[PDB]
Enzyme design. Structure first.
Site, PDB file in Angstrom:
ATOM      1  N   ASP B 204       0.820  -1.189   0.000  1.00  0.00           N
ATOM      2  CA  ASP B 204       0.000   0.000   0.000  1.00  0.00           C
ATOM      3  C   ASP B 204       0.865   1.254   0.000  1.00  0.00           C
ATOM      4  O   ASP B 204       1.814   1.357   0.785  1.00  0.00           O
ATOM      5  CB  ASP B 204      -0.900  -0.022   1.230  1.00  0.00           C
ATOM      6  CG  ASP B 204      -1.871   1.115   1.237  1.00  0.00           C
ATOM      7  OD1 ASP B 204      -2.246   1.530   0.119  1.00  0.00           O
ATOM      8  OD2 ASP B 204      -2.237   1.597   2.339  1.00  0.00           O
ATOM      9  N   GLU B 246       0.876  -0.712  -5.385  1.00  0.00           N
ATOM     10  CA  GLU B 246      -0.139   0.313  -5.656  1.00  0.00           C
ATOM     11  C   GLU B 246       0.584   1.649  -5.754  1.00  0.00           C
ATOM     12  O   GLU B 246       0.976   2.228  -4.736  1.00  0.00           O
ATOM     13  CB  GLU B 246      -1.204   0.354  -4.559  1.00  0.00           C
ATOM     14  CG  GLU B 246      -2.243   1.501  -4.714  1.00  0.00           C
ATOM     15  CD  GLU B 246      -2.629   2.202  -3.386  1.00  0.00           C
ATOM     16  OE1 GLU B 246      -3.851   2.343  -3.097  1.00  0.00           O
ATOM     17  OE2 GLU B 246      -1.713   2.627  -2.639  1.00  0.00           O
TER      18      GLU B 246
END
Ligand SMILES: [Ca+2]
Ligand SMILES: [Ca+2]
Ligand SMILES: [Mg+2]
Ligand SMILES: [Mg+2]
Lengths: 548, 548
Positions: B204, B246
Site C-alpha cells: 500500500d 499500488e
C-alpha cells in the site's frame, strides 16, 4: 394511409394484466388505471383477448354470451369508461371475435342439444345453429388441431344422441355457417360492440368456418364468402373500423384472406409464415428461409397490411412448416418434453432466446423493420418468462409484472390467490423482472423497446415502404431495403453468434452515402461495382438511411 | 513464465464477502465456503484487503497489529484453514501489507506519543518509529491526498506536545523509514505471513515512505532503495512469492517501481495510467488517449507484469490526469457533486456505465485484452451498484450479493445489522442482482465473464504477448495486436454508441485471413495495400486471430 397501417399493436388479457379490486383477477378498472403506461410505451392499438362470459375451458375463447362482460372483469359500464379513457388517450382498441364456435354452455348450444324438435313436437330453432351427424363419419380427412387433448372432431352429446363438430375442444361446438341465421347472429354480435365505439376486431380461427366433404375443411371458398360479407357490413355500416384475421396457413393461402380490390376481405392478416423461420434462422445462423418464405407471399391489396409478431398467447405454432423444420424447431427450442403442446412450443420470447438480450433485441428490430404493423405481446417489453408447470397454454399468460411488491403489483391478493400465479423464479420472477425497476434502470429492455419504437415512429418507410432483399453473400447476414416517399432505409442483421463478414450488392446505390439512423454516423460511399463490404459482430443490427 | 504473469486476480474484502456465523461481518470460514465459486469463475489469485486488528477508521488500512487477524474475521486458525483450502484448489492468495503508516491505536504509536523519554527516566525507543516535528513547518511543498478531510499532513498530539506526519488520516501516523528499526519491523511482519504460506503482498502507498525537505516527498530514490530491500529479502528467503505495488503516478514514475534487472523492486505495478483513459475514451468516443498514455510507458523488466483493472475499493482516481481531462471526467461521470471525493469518483463500474451491459462488456474485453494480468473487483462480475449514503469510499464496498434471501445471502443478520448494509434499490438491489440468479440465467453477466476469461485463458498471447496499435482511420475504433509464440491476435473495439466504419492498416499481414476466436468463422483475406475495411455496431468487440 388508414390508421392501422401506422399503428403498433399490443396484445393483453384483461384477466392477467392489472387487478383493480383485490380478488386476484384482472379487470377493466385495473386496465384503465394502466392506460398511460401503454401510451408512453408508444403503442397505438390495444388488442384485448376475449372478455365475454365463459366457463373458461379455453380461457375465454369458449363464449357463453357475445354481448356482455365476464363477471371477473367488471361490468359493461366499466368496459364503457375504459373505452372512453383509451380513446381520450389516442389509443385504438379492438376485440377478439370468436366466430367459429361457442362454449357448450352457451344458451344456443343448450337449446340445440334438445334435438331437432321440442317435446311439444314443434321444431327446435336452435338445433341447426350447430353441426350434427348421426355417426360422426363425415369430414374424415381432417386434421385435429388440439392433438394432445382431442382424439376426434366429432363428440357424442349424451342428450341429443348425436355427434357434433368441433375443431377445438369438445366444449367448443362449431357454429353451422350454412345456416343464414347463424351468420346474422354474428353480424349482430359485431354490431353490438362496434356501436359502443370499439375500433374493430381480431377475428379468431377464420379458416375453419365452413366444412365440405371431399376437402381439408380449411380455407374453403365458401368460408371466404362469409368473411367478405363481414367486411361488406363494416364497410357500409362502420367505415374505418379494422378487421384483423388469424389465419395460420401457408403463404399462398393466407394472402387470400385479404380478398381483392373489388371484393375486400380482411384489412390485416397475421404474418404466421415468417414467425417460425425467424427462430429457425437464429439457431441455424442462416437466414435463407426468411427470404424464401417472404418470397412466396404474393402482393396484397392497397388496403391490406401485414401484422408482424414474434409471440402471442398461444404456443409457438409449428403447424405450417415442413416435417424436417418442425423436428429441427423441437430439438432447438423444446429440449424438454413438457415444452411441447399440440404441434408447437409453449414458451415465452425471452426463455426461447435463452434470455440473451442481444438476441431479443435482434429479433425485435427485425420485427419492427419488416413490412407491416407490429404487435407486442404484453410483458415481452420487460422480458417476462413462462411458467411451464401450468396446463395447456396458461404458462405464457401469467400476470403482468409491474413491481417487486405483492404479486408483482398485479394484485393486492397473495400470489397463490391470483387467477394465474405471478412468476417468482430467480431468473424471471417479479423480483428481477418488473416494470418499476426498468423505469429506473437507464439501460433496461423497457427503455430500449420504447426508444426503438420511437426510432421506428420517426421513419414512415418502416410502416409504408416496399421491401427488397439484398444478396450479402453470407447466409448468416440478412439485408433488405425499405423505400417510401423519398427515403431509402437499408437494414442489415447478423443472425450468427459471432462476427460475420458480408458483401452487400448495392449496385443500384452507387454514389449514395449510407448513414446511421441513430446519429447519422457516416459509412463509406457506395462506389465502383457497388459490392459493399461489411463486418458485423454477433447479433448486430445496422439501421441505415441511404442518402442520395 | 512465473505464475503471476498468467493469473487472473480477484479483489475482495473479507468483512463484506460472506458472513459465516450470522454476526453481520464476513469472516474467513464464510470466505472459505465461496472458494469453489471463485475457482469456477476463472480466477487464480485472491487479493484480500487488510485483515489485521484495527479500529477501522480507514476500513482496515490503519493497522494496530501486523501479526494477527481482526476478531471480526475469525482467528489465525481460521485463516490457516482458508489458506490451506485455497491452495488445495490451486488458488494463490496475496495479502495487503500497509507499510507507510499504522493506526494511531497501534501499540508502537501509543508508546511513541509518550514522548522521547519515559517517566521512569529511561529513553523511549518507540518515539523515533514515527515522524515528529516541533512546529510542523517542514515538507510544505507537499500535496494533501485526502483533500476533502485533511487540512494538513502534520497534526498535534496532545500527549506528545509535538506534531507528527501523515499522508492520509490523522489516525494513520506515518512510519519513520529513516529509522532502520522500522525497516526490520516490516521485514518481520512480511516474514510472519510468508512463513504461513501466503503467496505475496499488495503493498500500500509505496510512493510515500520517505519524506525529504525540498521535494514532493514522492517517488524519492531513498523510498525506492527501501523497496529493493523488500524484494531482495523475498528473493533470498521466499522464492517465487509476488510483490505488487499500488502506485498511482504518471507513467515515467510508475515504471520505476519495477526496478531494474540488476536491482529489482516489484514484480507488478497496477496500471493506474490507462484506467482513467478507458472511461474517457467511452464518453469522448475517441480512443487516442488510450494509445498515447500506453506509449508513454517504457519497457518493464523481464520479471515485470502490469496489473490491469477497471475499478477497486477506492474512488476512480483522477489525480494523474490533466486539468482538462479531469473537468471532462467530472462532467461525464459525476453528475451529482456527492459522487466526487479526493480528486476522484466514488461509484461502481455498472453505475458509471449507466448499467449498460454492452458498455460493461466492452470495457471488460479491453481490460482482458491489454498486456498484463487483470484484477476483477468483487461484485462487478454480477453488476453491483453503490450506496452513496455511506461515508467516504464505503459505497463501493457493500456486501457481496449471493441470492435474493436475507441480506442477499451475505448474512442471516438483517441488512441493518450487517457491517455495511446490502444494496436494496430497484435497479441494483439483491432482489435483482445476485449470484444465484446469474448462475441460473444462461446469458447472465456472470456467465459472460466466466466465458470471456475462458477464451482469454485459451490464448496466452493475451497474458504474454507484445502490443502494437494499428491505425484504423476512425478515433472511435481502437485496434491492436498481441503476438506471442506463433500466434498473432487482432483485437478491434468500438467505443462509440452507434455503428462506425474504419479502415485497418493491415499491410504486414497481406495473404492472412482474420478468423474469429469464438466459433472459428473466417473473415475475408487481407489483400492489396492491406487497408482492410470494417464496420462495427455500438460497443462491438472483435477478438480475432490472424492465420498464417
Ligand atoms: Ca366450422
Ligand atoms: Ca511516510
Ligand atoms: Mg379483480
Ligand atoms: Mg461473521
Amino acid at each position: 394511409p388508414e390508421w392501422y397501417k401506422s399503428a403498433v399493436f399490443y396484445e393483453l388479457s384483461v384477466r392477467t394484466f392489472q387487478d383493480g379490486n383485490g380478488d386476484g383477477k384482472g379487470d377493466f378498472p385495473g386496465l384503465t388505471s394502466r392506460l398511460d403506461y401503454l401510451k408512453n410505451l408508444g403503442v397505438d392499438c390495444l388488442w384485448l383477448l376475449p372478455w365475454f362470459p365463459s366457463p373458461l375451458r379455453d380461457d375465454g375463447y369458449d363464449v357463453a354470451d357475445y354481448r356482455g362482460i365476464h363477471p371477473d372483469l367488471g361490468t359493461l359500464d366499466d368496459f364503457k369508461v375504459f373505452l372512453r379513457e383509451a380513446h381520450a388517450r389516442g389509443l385504438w382498441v379492438i376485440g377478439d371475435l370468436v366466430t367459429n364456435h361457442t362454449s357448450s354452455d352457451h344458451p344456443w348450444f343448450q337449446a340445440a342439444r334438445r334435438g331437432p324438435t321440442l317435446p311439444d313436437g314443434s321444431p327446435n330453432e336452435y338445433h341447426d345453429y350447430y353441426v350434427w351427424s348421426d355417426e360422426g363419419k363425415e369430414y374424415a380427412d381432417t386434421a385435429i388441431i388440439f392433438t394432445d387433448t382431442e382424439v376426434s372432431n366429432w363428440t357424442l352429446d349424451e342428450q341429443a344422441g348425436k355427434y357434433y363438430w368441433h375443431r377445438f375442444f369438445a366444449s367448443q361446438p362449431d357454429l353451422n355457417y350454412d345456416n343464414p341465421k347463424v351468420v346474422e347472429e354474428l353480424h349482430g354480435a359485431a354490431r353490438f360492440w362496434l356501436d359502443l365505439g370499439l375500433d374493430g376486431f381480431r377475428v379468431d380461427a377464420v379458416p375453419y368456418l365452413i366444412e365440405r366433404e371431399g376437402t381439408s375443411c380449411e380455407n374453403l371458398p365458401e368460408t371466404h364468402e362469409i368473411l367478405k360479407g363481414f367486411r361488406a357490413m363494416v364497410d357500409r355500416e362502420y367505415p374505418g373500423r379494422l378487421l384483423l384475421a388469424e389465419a395460420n396457413q401457408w403463404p399462398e393461402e393466407v394472402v387470400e384472406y385479404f380478398g381483392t380490390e373489388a371484393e375486400p376481405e380482411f384489412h390485416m392478416c397475421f404474418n404466421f409464415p415468417v414467425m417460425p423461420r425467424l427462430y429457425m434462422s437464429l439457431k441455424r445462423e442462416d437466414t435463407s428461409s426468411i427470404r424464401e418464405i417472404m418470397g412466396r407471399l404474393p402482393k396484397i391489396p392497397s388496403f391490406g397490411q401485414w401484422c408482424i409478431f414474434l409471440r402471442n398467447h398461444d404456443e409457438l405454432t409449428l403447424e405450417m412448416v415442413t416435417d424436417d423444420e418442425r423436428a429441427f424447431m423441437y430439438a432447438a427450442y423444446a429440449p424438454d418434453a413438457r415444452m411441447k403442446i399440440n404441434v408447437g412450443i409453449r414458451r415465452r420470447l425471452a426463455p426461447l432466446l435463452d434470455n440473451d438480450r442481444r438476441r431479443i433485441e435482434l429479433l425485435n428490430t427485425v420485427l419492427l423493420a419488416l413490412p407491416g404493423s407490429p404487435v407486442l405481446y404484453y410483458g415481452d417489453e420487460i422480458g417476462m418468462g413462462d411458467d411451464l408447470g401450468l396446463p395447456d397454454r396458461n404458462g405464457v399468460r401469467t400476470p403482468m409484472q409491474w413491481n417487486a411488491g405483492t404479486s408483482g403489483g398485479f394484485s393486492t391478493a397473495q400470489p397463490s390467490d391470483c387467477f394465474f400465479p405471478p412468476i417468482q423464479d430467480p431468473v424471471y420472477g417479479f423480483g428481477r423482472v418488473n416494470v418499476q425497476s426498468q423505469l429506473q434502470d437507464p439501460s433496461s429492455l423497457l427503455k430500449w423497446t420504447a426508444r426503438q419504437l420511437e426510432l421506428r415512429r420517426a421513419h414512415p418507410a418502416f410502416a409504408h415502404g416496399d421491401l427488397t432483399f439484398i444478396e450479402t453473400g453470407n447466409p448468416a447476414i440478412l439485408a433488405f431495403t425499405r423505400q417510401y416517399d423519398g427515403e431509402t432505409l437499408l437494414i442489415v442483421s447478423n443472425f450468427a453468434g459471432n462476427a460475420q463478414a458480408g458483401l452487400l450488392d448495392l449496385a443500384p446505390f452507387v454514389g449514395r452515402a449510407p448513414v446511421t439512423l441513430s446519429g447519422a454516423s457516416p459509412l463509406p460511399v457506395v462506389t465502383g461495382n457497388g459490392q459493399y463490404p461489411v463486418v458485423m459482430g454477433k447479433y448486430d443490427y445496422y439501421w441505415l438511411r441511404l442518402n442520395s
